[PDB]
Amino acid sequence: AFLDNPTIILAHIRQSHVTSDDTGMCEMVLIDHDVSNTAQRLERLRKERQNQIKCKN
Amino acid sequence: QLPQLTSLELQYVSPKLLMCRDLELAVPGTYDPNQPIIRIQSIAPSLQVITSKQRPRKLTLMGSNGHEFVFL
Amino acid sequence: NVPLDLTREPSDNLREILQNVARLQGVSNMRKLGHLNNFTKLLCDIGHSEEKLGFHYEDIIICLRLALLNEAKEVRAAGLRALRYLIQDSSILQKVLKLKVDYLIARCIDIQQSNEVERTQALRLVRKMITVNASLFPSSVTNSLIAVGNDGLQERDRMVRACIAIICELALQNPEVVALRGGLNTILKNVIDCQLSRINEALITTILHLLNHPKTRQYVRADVELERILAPYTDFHYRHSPDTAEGQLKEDREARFLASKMGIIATFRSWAGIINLCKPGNSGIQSLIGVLCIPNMEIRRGLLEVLYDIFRLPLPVVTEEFIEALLSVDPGRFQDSWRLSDGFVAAEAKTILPHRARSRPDLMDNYLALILSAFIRNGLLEGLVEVITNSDDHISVRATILLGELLHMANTILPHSHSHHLHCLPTLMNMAASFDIPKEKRLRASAALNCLKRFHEMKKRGPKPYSLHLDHIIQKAIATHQKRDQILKDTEEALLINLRDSQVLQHKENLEWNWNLIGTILKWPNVNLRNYKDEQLHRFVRRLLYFYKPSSKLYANLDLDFAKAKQLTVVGCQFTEFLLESEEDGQGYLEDLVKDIVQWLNASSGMKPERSLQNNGLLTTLSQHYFLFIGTLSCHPHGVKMLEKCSVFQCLLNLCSLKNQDHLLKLTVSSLDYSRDGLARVILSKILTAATDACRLYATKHLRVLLRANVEFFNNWGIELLVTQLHDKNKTISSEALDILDEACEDKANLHALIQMKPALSHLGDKGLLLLLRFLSIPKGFSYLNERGYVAKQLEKWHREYNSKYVDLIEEQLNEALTTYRKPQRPHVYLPIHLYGQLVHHKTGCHLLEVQNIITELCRNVRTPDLDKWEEIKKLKASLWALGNIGSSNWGLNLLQEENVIPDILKLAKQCEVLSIRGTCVYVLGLIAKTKQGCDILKCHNWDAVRHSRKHLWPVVPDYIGLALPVDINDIFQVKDIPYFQTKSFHLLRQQMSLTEIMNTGLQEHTDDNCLYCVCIEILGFQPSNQLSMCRILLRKEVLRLVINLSSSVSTKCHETGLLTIKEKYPQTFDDICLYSEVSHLLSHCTFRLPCRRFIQELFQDVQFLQMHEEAEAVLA
Ligand SMILES: Nc1ncnc2c1ncn2[C@@H]1O[C@H](COP(=O)(O)OP(=O)(O)OP(O)(O)=S)[C@@H](O)[C@H]1O
């Protein structure tokens, strides 16, 4: 086969990612017009540190 | 992929060991100057890896007198 | 919110971006996002210019990058969208890139904070950034995209493929910034966990494209990058991901096998994969053959599917006996397209009857010969013999069939020196004849050789007609071809014995008769009811007549898939011709039979008011075979007379006009006989001119059945019918008739018939022009077109435009053949018609071409290539195809050897840098060898060719098919090596000192540039940063060394808990923007995992950054 010039390779990439993607995103992303877990960890560590420091070492 | 290792083929691991078919070396560990020597005739083409932390292989040579010499 | 759009643009945009800055208090997010929508509308209707907007670009960039920092996802998406509409030239992108907005864009990519609309605008913005200027793409967004696409499948991210597509689009225009941060490794490891074929090939095409041109070939390692894709096969215990679910371990292995198989069979369709995988060193093809010779029944059974799908061979069924899998690879086996509903006779005749071209090049054979020679050179046949002997039966049968197919392909598409010593098979015959080895190996070698002989007999048998209509068509064509150019008596005794044992006259019960004996009485020569006047024979034929009539409802009610269904139909055809064999005594039965047939067909067609609907009885029973009787009634000259004595032809003429039943026209158009002139051609012309569009298309497609079967006098009426079909209203029918004519003009007697009735092929597409260019190949027609000023009109047109469009045509055909591109089983990639190929044939247009002096600039273009841009490579491809089409006959080599350009192409075929034109030169040198003089020229330069045509299957070793190959296949696989582009205090203190005991600037690489805030204090007059509350400088270097140690991914938990304790104890150390800029610059230059990078970027989330906001509002107003 002859997929060597960048235009045919670009067109193949765009049509392959647009048509054969089950999830939506690509046909919104590849539009050719232009061609909190750490908060949970911090609040848990806060409530653990509140009860934790009560003794002398 | 280290617990999956339980057998070794000599065509895959070291292809020069299974193509010997005769040697002038003696079988290791058995040589005394007052006895006729036993030469290494053949090597078995499959090794079994023992399930351990160091995984010792089970080599089995075949001497010239028709007796199998199992090693580790 | 509140749009006016009729005011001063400077006042409007100043209050616009001032309300965007909003002083971090007393302004809601809804009015800010509505204001951003108003801003992008104002930038849409009024063009961007620094004079009519009233402000410089820089203030708009500073007040647009603040919208990315607000907590609402909607205002962030609106800010990204409004920033996308601003980037329109390189200067705006450079001004956006000088102050570090790319840190904020890379931040807004990787949060996954339940926002799938906010992350889309960021990817659209960076696609616009790649589009405007790809040589200035920052490393921040590059590292962000690589981190998302590298560890996104495990974290269930839904933007994985959308990021890998942007990475592949970036790697075509700026490969160094992708290869530096390790993006090519992400691409290469992303083809092994992608089951989708098109995405897998689109990912591997960029890697094979970097290996094509040398300037991009410097960015790929030698034997460790491309050869990763054959790592699931070469490594027996392959672990792709380090942390995966142990519950799925077999399905993951099959997924790896499928994706690696798709990648391997996708690299062998490109020249940069063929040359780079078959290098003369310790290549990646020898490791693929070497692991095939190892008795591991899981890799060995999976490599055979790859070898079957590389050579485009059909897979046999999984069995243990050779005679069952040999039947499944029969070329004449039944397929689902051959049913009456889909593709009744035409799709079957496409498969079983051969093509009419015997001298066309057929580039698929060139590619398969190159692949087969490259595989045989690395020792595939010895490995196949070793798989045949020392393996299980399930794999031995499949490897025996594969070896049979390869040995049949060798004596068909390979040159004689490559394939005169392959059929001996020394390693198998020396094993089958050695009585020193154990007897099991000897006997299985002898059994394998017997199965190879059986496969050769099956191959030399050929495909046979499965149907009974195509069988009668081929038999009638063979009969007339035999009849154009030029037994026992058993009087009364043995006939009576045979009709006694036939059991017809003993009892009237059907399905109990001896039908072999009935066939033998009906097909014996001299018994024909005209010389043997016996009453028992009349009883026999009357019982058979009453059985075969549809009104009696005996034969017309047996359903399809019956035990004996073809035999009853064959006996019926020979019975209704045996009735015609007595033309003076066989009227009373034959007339009754054909009257009952036309009565049934008028009742079922809809010529009655009872039901007019019996499609459920014709389509599933044997009552559809009553056309075949009319078929075997239509061949004989006395048959058409008897057929017209009843109202049969008029009945089909009225059948042609109806609209509801399309299957009956398929039945009558494939049964009748069109050998002689009469009323049978009128029905065919009426279906072709005025019928249903699907029936018209099928009648136009049923001319291959009359062309490929060599029906005589086809050039009289078939060419007339095709020219008449070219004027059809429907477009698919006209294009199909154009394709039938393009196939039929491969015979000179048909091209002379087409020229004598001059058509108008110019008002159609490029296919009509390419068909009309075939007129130049003979003097009668060239001299016709030369008077009206057409050849000189086409010469300059092909000189300026259509020489570089012919290469697009042949590349589009090859891509549609074997790369699954589909521009908006093995096919036949036949070469398109080139005007330079047609002018040279007859020595008059050869001289007309020579006086124009077009070969001189062509040889100058081949001798002086640029090989730097991509337009001059296209021009060199056009010149090479033009020279190869010029040198396709004996009058072309004469003017082609005056400049000596054939050694130039032969040197370009083995010393070039770009590999695509190195394959183009192979195709051109194959096209050169279509004559004996061409192969004799190529033999002096050590390039062999095939010396036989496509006329005979087994030609005796002493116009041709175009195929030429080097004597040593490793000559064109030489690539000159290119070196890789890479070869050209507190950290000691924190080990023994804790954080609490040291409690009783810290930025290492922080300068005026590369800071979020400090860049603006020089250009736009921002006030310098305030002094914050040695109490904070040590925490700065502590969080910096923690985020440094988080990069190694060795023990991430301790460092993230340390960062959490720092954030809990001092929530104000994450507020200085000169530290956030430093950790963003550190993220822009290291390899962080995706959860670690998300945690680092989310640590700085709930921050105020008040001072930059208020001083931006101060510098604006
Ligand atoms: N299933 C059948 N197959 C053949 N003939 C049948 C069948 N069923 C009924 N028949 C009758 O057999 C007739 C043909 O037989 P003839 O040629 O007259 O020989 P035949 O022995 O004189 O018949 P008959 O009944 O003795 S007068 C048919 O036309 C029907 O009348």
Ligand SMILES: [Zn+2]
């Ligand atoms: Zn700074």
